[PDB]
Amino acid sequence: ESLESWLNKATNPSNRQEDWEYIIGFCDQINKELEGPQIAVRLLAHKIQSPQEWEALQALTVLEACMKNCGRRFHNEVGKFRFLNELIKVVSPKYLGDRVSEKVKTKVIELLYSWTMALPEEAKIKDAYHMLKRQGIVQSDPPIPVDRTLI
């Protein structure tokens, strides 16, 4: 099925629990699609900025899965401000910030922080993260789950 089809099912607010079947289905689809990466980020950005917390949370988990399954061609898309700004808006009071839960915000910060280490190649991700700290959105670097593949 289509990219949106997979994601809609992988981020459905009604899901009683995460459905890794669809999460993986979404990733495999992107790896097949000529424009899967470009379409995928825009689709994910939107789901992540959703007022429904469970939808946004699931979207973040799907985003995490994509980074580990969709290789370099996905990383390049996530590494552009065009997508990065969408995440900033989620944690910045000037935008969605004051209407988004902490769980969602910290997850975003965690992922962003994680990427600055994992993707030293994507310089735009670092600038995005520093800008956050500089503006006081991120007081200190947060602790993160142990993953020895994060180089």
């Binding site: 552009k80 401000f81 065009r82 700004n85 900033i88 995005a128 959105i137």
Partner: peptide
């Protein structure tokens, strides 16, 4: 091709 870093 890309946008500029958003500013708060």
């Amino acid at each position: 091709s890309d946008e500029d870093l958003l500013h708060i």
